[PDB]
Amino acid sequence: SAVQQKLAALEKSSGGRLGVALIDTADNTQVLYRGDERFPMCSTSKVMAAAAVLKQSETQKQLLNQPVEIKPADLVNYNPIAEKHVNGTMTLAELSAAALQYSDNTAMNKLIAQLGGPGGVTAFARAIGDETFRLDRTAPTLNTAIPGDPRDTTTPRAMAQTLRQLTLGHALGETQRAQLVTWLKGNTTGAASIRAGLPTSWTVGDKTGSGDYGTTNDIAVIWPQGRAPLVLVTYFTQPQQNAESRRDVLASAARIIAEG
Numbered sequence: 464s465a466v467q468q469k470l471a472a473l474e475k476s477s478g479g480r481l482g483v484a485l486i487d488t489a490d491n492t493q494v495l496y497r498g499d500e501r502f503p504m505c506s507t508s509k510v511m512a513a514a515a516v517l518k519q520s521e522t523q524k525q526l527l528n529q530p531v532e533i534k535p536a537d538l539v540n541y542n543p544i545a546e547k548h549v550n551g552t553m554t555l556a557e558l559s560a561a562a563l564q565y566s567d568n569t570a571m572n573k574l575i576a577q578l579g580g581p582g583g584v585t586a587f588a589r590a591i592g593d594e595t596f597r598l599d600r601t602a603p604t605l606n607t608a609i610p611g612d613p614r615d616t617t618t619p620r621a622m623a624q625t626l627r628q629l630t631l632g633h634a635l636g637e638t639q640r641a642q643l644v645t646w647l648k649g650n651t652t653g654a655a656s657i658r659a660g661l662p663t664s665w666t667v668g669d670k671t672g673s674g675d676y677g678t679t680n681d682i683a684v685i686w687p688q689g690r691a692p693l694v695l696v697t698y699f700t701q702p703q704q705n706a707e708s709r710r711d712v713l714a715s716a717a718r719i720i721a722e723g
């Protein structure tokens with residue numbers, strides 16, 4: 464197509480490896496660029512963890528109100544919210560909000576522990592039909608993003624298909640799906656990524672990701688006004704370990720997609 468040429472041109476101008484997957488839910492067509500290649504998810508895998516706890520809430524009705532201790536030894540590299548409740552407690556609802564809207568790594572590790580380890584997160588992915596998603600490590604070592612390392616990776620095709628079933632499909636209950644949609648719309652970390660390349664009248668819920676080798680990710684569900692919703696995944700990684708983040712590439716990919 465024409466989007467393929469411009470995405471390939473954007474990737475050439477960036478010096479890195481770009482992966483894009485779009486699903487238009489009006490006709491279920493797919494716009495893929497390197498859609499079957501493996502990319503490090505970094506903190507875009509947090510959506511899987513929050514959705515798995517939400518799935519647990521379908522049986523444990525009062526699970527999200529359960530308090531969880533935040534002790535100093537739980538602190539890691541980036542804890543913007545959990546820093547404020549040390550020697551106190553946060554409920555699983557506020558931990559999911561801290562993980563999704565502020566990318567709190569301590570909040571993520573608390574979701575992983577609630578699920579019985581990273582194997583419990585991958586289990587939820589297989590239970591909803593995702594055979595590519597694999598979580599192998601806790602935060603922050605899941606952000607190492609070594610080239611060729613299969614740990615903590617997924618493909619754009621699989622992540623877009625899964626994100627649709629969670630936010631638009633019916634892998635979750637209504638209260639759970641609406642709670643996940645509300646969380647993603649309140650994200651505070653994606654102003655410079657997918658959101659920066661979309662028409663400002665479009666409402667977006669998204670989750671960003673960052674890691675070593677300049678890894679810059681963003682997955683998003685997009686509601687255009689007067690049009691069926693869309694799902695967009697943008698993965699980007701770079702050859703140099705000390706590479707700087709490239710959120711501008713994610714915006715440019717979204718603009719190329721939105722024009723399509």
Ligand SMILES: *C(=O)[C@@H](NC(=O)[C@H](N)c1ccccc1)[C@@H]1N[C@@H](C(=O)O)C(C)(C)S1
Pocket residue numbers: 505506507540541565566568603606652670671672673674675
């Ligand atoms: C996952 O994406 C997380 N990233 C990390 O833990 C990295 N070790 C890191 C990268 C850059 C600065 C500090 C730590 C969290 N999610 C990122 C994001 O959404 O962009 C993050 C920078 C907020 S940290």
